[PDB]
Structure formats: C-alpha cells, structure tokens
Amino acid sequence: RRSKETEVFYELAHELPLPHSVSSHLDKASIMRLAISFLRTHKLLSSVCSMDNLYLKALEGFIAVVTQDGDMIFLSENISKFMGLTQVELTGHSIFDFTHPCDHEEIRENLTLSTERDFFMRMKCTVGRTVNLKSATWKVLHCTGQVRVLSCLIIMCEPIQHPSHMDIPLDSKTFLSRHSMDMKFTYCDDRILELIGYHPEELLGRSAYEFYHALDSENMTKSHQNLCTKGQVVSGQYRMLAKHGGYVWLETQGTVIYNPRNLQPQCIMCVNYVLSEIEKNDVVFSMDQTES
Amino acid sequence: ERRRRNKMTAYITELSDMVPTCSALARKPDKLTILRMAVSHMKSLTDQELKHLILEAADGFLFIVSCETGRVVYVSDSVTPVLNQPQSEWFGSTLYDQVHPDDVDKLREQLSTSRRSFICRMRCPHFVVVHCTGYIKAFCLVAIGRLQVPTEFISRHNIEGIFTFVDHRCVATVGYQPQELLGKNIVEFCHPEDQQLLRDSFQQVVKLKGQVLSVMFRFRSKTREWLWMRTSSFTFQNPYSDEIEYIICTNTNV
Ligand SMILES: Nc1ccc2cc3ccc(N)cc3nc2c1
C-alpha cells in the first residue's frame, strides 16, 4: 500500500513545473511543501493579473514571495546561483530561519501594512563555489518590492557585488574609491578628474560628507548606518559637489572589506556610478569651489 | 517522533482544499486519492506570469538589443507600464534613441568586446533613472530594465560658524551670491546687538547634540538691510563615531 504511496509521490514530484533532475530527489514532505506553495503562488498570481531563460538569466538577483507570518511561499530557481541554497531547499520555510536575526524586526516592519518596500537583509549563503550549511556565510541582499492584500510580500533580492570580485564590466562614467570607516577618502582612482574635476590627491583628508548636497546628507547617513550594521549598501541617487560650480548625480555601492588574516574591518570600497553631468555650472555651493 | 505525521496530515488537508474540483465535495477523500487528484489537476494546469512578477516586485520589463546597431530586437510589453511607452516605439528604434544624450558613451561601452549591468536615464525631454541588468547572447543583450526611487534657504557651518555650504536660493533670500557668504562666519552678517544671541545659540546646538534650536535675528542683506530671520539648526553627527561633522541650518525670512 505504501508501494502505491511512495510511487505516486514521486510521480507527483516529477511534473511539478521543474526538471525531474530535482523532482526526482525529494522526500515526500518536500513534495508537499512545494505542491502547496506552488498552488498558493498560482493563486496570488491570479490575484495580481486582473522561454524564460531570458527573464531568469537577465536578472542579477531573484524573486521571493513571502507571507506575513514569514513563510516563503515562492522563490525563483536562480537563487541557487546567488545564495547557493536551492528553491527546493527553501519554499515553505520561515524567512526568519534564514535571515540574520537583528534584521528580523526590520523584516517584520517591511512585512506589514504605501506598499513600496526597499530594505537590506542578510541571508544565509553557501557558496570558488558551493559549501554546506554548516559553515554558511551571511550575504547581504537589496530587497525591493511591494506588499499586498491576507498580507503578502513580493520582492526582488539583488546581491550588491563585492568590488574585488567582479563579474560585470565597468564604464567610463564609473569611478572607484576607498574610505576609512569615517567615509574619509583614503583612496580614489583617477577617473574622478574626468568625471567630477578633483585630483584624487585632494580628497585624502576629507570625509565624504563634505561633498554631499545638504539635501542628501541624511539619506547618506542611513546608508552609512546600514553599511556598517549589515556590511554592504546601495545608496539612493544623490548629488556630489563638483570641483567648481554645481554637482553631478551619483549612486554608490559600498562594501565593508575585511582583513583576511585579521578578520577586522579595513576600509570601505565604493563603486561610484556617475549618473549625470555637472548640472549647475554657474552655481557654487561649497568653499573649495570658490578658489581660482 | 511523530509530529511528522500531523503536519503530513496538515499537508493533506491544506493541499486538498485548494484543488477546486476536490474542494467541491461534502466528504473529502483518502491519502492517495487527494494526491493523484492534485496530480491530474496540476497536469490540467510559471511562464509570462513570471514577467508580471517582475513588474510587480521590481517595476521592471524585459528587452533585447543588438550589440551591433543598438536597435531593439525585442521589448516586453511591460515597457508600457514602466516607461509609459508603446511597444511600437521600441521596435523600430535604437536604445540610444531611448536614453538621455549624456548617457550614450556608457551605453557604447556596455555593448563592447559576458554579463552586463548599468544605470541610465530613459525617456517616457523627461527622463527617469533605470537599472538595466542582463547578459550577452547569440550578438545581443538580453536585459531587464528596472525603476525605483522662496521663503527660505539651507546652509551648513563648521562649529565656528564659517559658511561651508549655501543653497543657490541664498541669492534670492538675502541678495548674496553663495561666493559672498561661503568662507565667512555667520555672526558677521549679524546685528551687533544680536551677535551674542547668535553666539550662544551655536553653543546650545553643539552642547546638545542632534536636536534642533531656533533663533531670530537681523541679518545683513546685500542692500545692507537688517532682516529678521529665524534660523533653526542642529548638529550633524557621523553615524559611526558620533562626533560632529558640522551644523545644518535652515534660514527662513520672518
Ligand atoms: N541623472 C539623474 C538622476 C536623477 C535625477 C533626478 C532628478 C530629480 C528631479 C529633477 N528635476 C531632475 C532630476 N535629474 C536627475 C538626473
């Protein structure tokens, strides 16, 4: 009778919308978890709608859908690519069991009750490449999505990328820089000069805050706070003052980098994406811009 | 050892009830039958709805562009809710045509001699910041595009009161070009009478770190006219060290 049972389980497992490659290797429990969560997903999708190696591969992050009690009803495949952890390993389980607690309250606040959500969370990563969950590491995800009614969170979890280990090319409109924990410039490359007008030599003593438009300081504050607590951030769009009048728009991804043999923090590395040209050229904002 | 059993049974209930043509029964069937029921039903039933999943969480849309011409090979209809743009417009078109003029060089370099990602302003002369994330494939780019996001004037000072920053509105507010305040201490534009009032005010903002304080005084306009002004300000402390970066004021004509 369990003959019939086990065999029907596996049969079931097979044509869930997944390869028998993975369908094959399931404990009945997983088949359940996944069955249900698959149904729930099709429902919620019906709730919102009233060949895809493209969308999967085009993405440099994955899709999570997570209930209000925190159970992750659905997760896109390529999560394994970014997190190591497979969809199979995860659907149905509590988000809180795979996230750095200390991030849990904040996760709870973005889980409930504008529906736009934008926050950073640390998640368990097990990737050279693959390890096991024993020595798992904390990976920061930028998560952006919408919450929905039930209550329900649909987010895209984008990894921030670690500057020493790139996978994408970089542009001419992108410069790179190093800071103390103070965000004092300690280093900057010589793309600055062409991009905003400073010699790198000039910025060494200087904290980064000297160069933000006042209108952006607090937002930056938020980023800093987060960079430190979590270890990485992507900042919003913000203006940096240029060598003479006016400013250019920017977006900076910051990563705390660690001494490998010391396991202490070292500096902050910043991939700084310049998003514009000097906007106001006529207008002078700070003391340095007045010289000459 | 056996609460395995009771959420296997929880599984069988919970599962059983979202299969409709099974939910529709007064009596609810056995193990295998609920299982094969779900099976055959699933068979009866992850593709473009994925696309809208993208549109809902990320506010994004798919597009393929030839690395050759920059001409748009394909654009997902999700472009329309994102960019307020007809698929029409993006099919006879080149992606260079769809961005900000200043964003062109960047684009030339993302389409040059793997995997790609960048930020650029795309038109809906009105542009929005868009993050495109994709990869190269047989010679093309398959990527996804994603969205997100006078009475007075603001200034910043070092603790001594030297102007270290003014917003351009200063010129309208007090008649001065930024150049004429920047570098000079704020108490110099102050009526001698109110100077102590200004000084002590700085004390209070620094002694008490983080909260805001207001002060009213006469400020020397560029036509040399004493202007009652309220300025209200607080210190800005580094998030890591909590020592004092500088003071932020807002100066509002009264
Ligand atoms: N490259 C960029 C990036 C963000 C921008 C945000 C803006 C907001 C308001 C406005 N009037 C113009 C803007 N221009 C931008 C140009």
Side-chain angles (χ1 to χ4, degrees):
Chain A
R1 65 182 181 88
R2 31 160 181 84
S3 157
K4 231 75 186 76
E5 161 173 47
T6 67
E7 304 210 348
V8 68
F9 270 103
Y10 179 31
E11 178 174 358
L12 167 52
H14 271 319
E15 288 303 4
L16 295 159
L18 48 80
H20 60 285
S21 153
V22 298
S23 98
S24 317
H25 296 155
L26 295 187
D27 67 329
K28 301 175 180 159
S30 302
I31 306 168
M32 311 319 296
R33 272 192 280 105
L34 271 94
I36 282 152
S37 305
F38 166 82
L39 306 173
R40 308 190 171 180
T41 321
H42 173 240
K43 266 287 164 267
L44 170 69
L45 282 180
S46 60
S47 175
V48 80
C49 294
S50 318
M51 148 156 279
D52 312 318
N53 55 39
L54 310 189
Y55 287 81
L56 274 202
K57 289 209 73 61
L59 290 185
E60 266 124 42
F62 60 91
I63 288 302
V65 176
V66 183
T67 59
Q68 70 294 332
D69 288 34
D71 294 66
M72 302 169 287
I73 72 180
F74 172 83
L75 302 164
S76 42
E77 165 201 288
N78 68 332
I79 179 193
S80 200
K81 225 204 78 157
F82 304 113
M83 297 298 111
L85 299 164
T86 58
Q87 160 169 215
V88 163
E89 271 167 325
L90 265 44
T91 55
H93 295 308
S94 189
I95 183 52
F96 298 106
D97 291 339
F98 295 86
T99 54
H100 198 294
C102 277
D103 290 330
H104 284 188
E105 289 175 2
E106 182 173 5
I107 289 175
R108 198 153 308 118
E109 248 194 301
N110 278 279
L111 279 178
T112 73
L113 189 127
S114 208
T115 65
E116 294 77 11
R117 297 304 181 258
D118 185 323
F119 62 106
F120 299 82
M121 46 183 286
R122 289 161 284 186
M123 208 199 213
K124 293 185 186 180
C125 181
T126 68
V127 284
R129 294 180 182 77
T130 283
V131 175
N132 263 27
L133 183 71
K134 328 193 184 194
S135 321
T137 201
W138 292 120
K139 210 177 202 83
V140 186
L141 294 161
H142 192 206
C143 303
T144 40
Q146 297 275 0
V147 58
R148 178 172 252 281
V149 173
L150 157 68
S151 163
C152 186
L153 190 57
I154 317 168
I155 51 174
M156 178 199 44
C157 328
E158 329 160 69
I160 291 147
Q161 191 186 205
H162 193 285
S164 52
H165 300 291
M166 266 176 11
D167 305 332
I168 72 144
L170 275 181
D171 319 342
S172 154
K173 295 174 195 167
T174 299
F175 78 92
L176 204 138
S177 62
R178 184 164 84 74
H179 295 97
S180 56
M181 322 304 293
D182 305 323
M183 294 290 312
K184 292 178 180 163
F185 289 78
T186 65
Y187 156 84
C188 202
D189 65 351
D190 305 72
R191 302 171 113 157
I192 314 170
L193 185 51
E194 49 173 0
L195 284 176
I196 60 187
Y198 312 88
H199 293 272
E201 326 186 298
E202 303 188 326
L203 305 174
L204 277 60
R206 324 292 301 283
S207 90
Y209 288 94
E210 308 177 358
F211 305 90
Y212 300 160
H213 191 280
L215 248 56
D216 292 313
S217 297
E218 221 62 30
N219 316 337
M220 303 302 101
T221 321
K222 238 198 315 191
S223 323
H224 202 177
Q225 292 159 218
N226 246 336
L227 180 46
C228 296
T229 58
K230 316 261 210 306
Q232 291 182 94
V233 290
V234 196
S235 78
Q237 303 146 32
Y238 65 96
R239 321 145 189 87
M240 155 159 299
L241 309 170
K243 165 81 172 192
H244 308 302
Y247 48 76
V248 300
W249 286 93
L250 249 68
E251 174 166 315
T252 299
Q253 308 172 17
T255 310
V256 167
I257 84 169
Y258 290 85
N259 198 313
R261 326 165 273 258
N262 160 8
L263 286 195
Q264 262 43 41
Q266 284 259 291
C267 61
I268 296 163
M269 284 314 292
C270 275
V271 181
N272 322 85
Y273 294 105
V274 166
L275 308 183
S276 76
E277 304 268 4
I278 299 95
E279 277 203 320
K280 307 186 167 182
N281 249 341
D282 38 338
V283 185
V284 149
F285 297 83
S286 154
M287 277 214 276
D288 311 286
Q289 300 179 356
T290 59
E291 61 173 353
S292 181
Chain B
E1 320 283 36
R2 318 152 213 80
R3 93 181 52 175
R4 58 187 176 91
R5 259 145 39 162
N6 319 99
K7 179 161 194 210
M8 185 63 199
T9 59
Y11 281 154
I12 191 66
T13 301
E14 165 194 11
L15 177 84
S16 160
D17 299 316
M18 258 293 133
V19 194
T21 198
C22 172
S23 67
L25 307 163
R27 106 176 297 276
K28 216 179 54 151
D30 63 310
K31 59 194 181 72
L32 310 106
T33 311
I34 296 174
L35 288 194
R36 343 205 65 188
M37 269 172 169
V39 171
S40 184
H41 186 202
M42 279 205 186
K43 289 197 285 215
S44 175
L45 267 46
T46 48
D47 60 351
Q48 282 197 319
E49 36 194 333
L50 166 54
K51 141 193 159 178
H52 196 296
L53 209 32
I54 309 310
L55 182 58
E56 175 61 20
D59 179 346
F61 65 103
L62 180 90
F63 62 103
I64 297 109
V65 160
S66 54
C67 292
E68 320 169 16
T69 51
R71 193 175 286 185
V72 188
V73 166
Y74 172 66
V75 49
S76 170
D77 73 331
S78 295
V79 63
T80 321
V82 183
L83 260 308
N84 173 358
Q85 278 288 47
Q87 193 153 359
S88 153
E89 178 36 12
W90 287 61
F91 215 77
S93 189
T94 278
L95 188 67
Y96 302 116
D97 298 322
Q98 303 303 158
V99 290
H100 202 279
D102 287 340
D103 283 337
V104 165
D105 300 29
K106 164 185 287 205
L107 193 43
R108 304 204 328 111
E109 313 172 347
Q110 296 276 355
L111 298 175
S112 289
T113 34
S114 210
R115 189 157 180 98
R116 303 299 190 273
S117 160
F118 59 93
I119 312 154
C120 60
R121 303 155 277 176
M122 304 178 171
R123 88 187 285 284
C124 315
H126 195 184
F127 299 90
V128 286
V129 171
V130 186
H131 291 264
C132 311
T133 278
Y135 66 106
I136 316 287
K137 164 186 170 141
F139 325 106
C140 270
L141 169 78
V142 188
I144 287 176
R146 166 185 84 78
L147 257 193
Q148 65 273 354
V149 305
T151 52
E152 63 173 350
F153 79 105
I154 305 187
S155 60
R156 312 195 300 217
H157 297 89
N158 48 348
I159 44 166
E160 304 91 5
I162 300 286
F163 281 91
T164 299
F165 173 98
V166 302
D167 195 350
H168 59 80
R169 299 190 286 181
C170 64
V171 64
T173 290
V174 289
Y176 291 106
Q177 302 281 98
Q179 317 77 304
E180 296 175 282
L181 313 181
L182 287 165
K184 297 185 182 93
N185 196 287
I186 181 170
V187 313
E188 250 173 305
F189 296 85
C190 184
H191 196 286
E193 277 186 21
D194 308 336
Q195 286 185 353
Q196 183 60 254
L197 215 55
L198 188 44
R199 305 174 193 123
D200 62 24
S201 85
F202 261 56
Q203 293 173 356
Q204 306 182 31
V205 160
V206 307
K207 269 173 309 188
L208 300 92
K209 308 188 340 172
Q211 293 177 335
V212 192
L213 266 85
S214 295
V215 210
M216 289 180 197
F217 68 88
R218 285 158 301 187
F219 184 116
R220 201 176 49 98
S221 155
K222 182 135 189 306
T223 74
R224 272 267 195 169
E225 179 192 20
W226 300 106
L227 302 189
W228 282 102
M229 195 144 294
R230 192 209 345 94
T231 176
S232 177
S233 60
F234 57 94
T235 59
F236 184 103
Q237 307 96 351
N238 189 290
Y240 183 80
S241 64
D242 194 17
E243 285 307 315
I244 301 83
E245 297 290 326
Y246 56 73
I247 304 172
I248 61 171
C249 306
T250 76
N251 314 282
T252 309
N253 275 65
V254 168

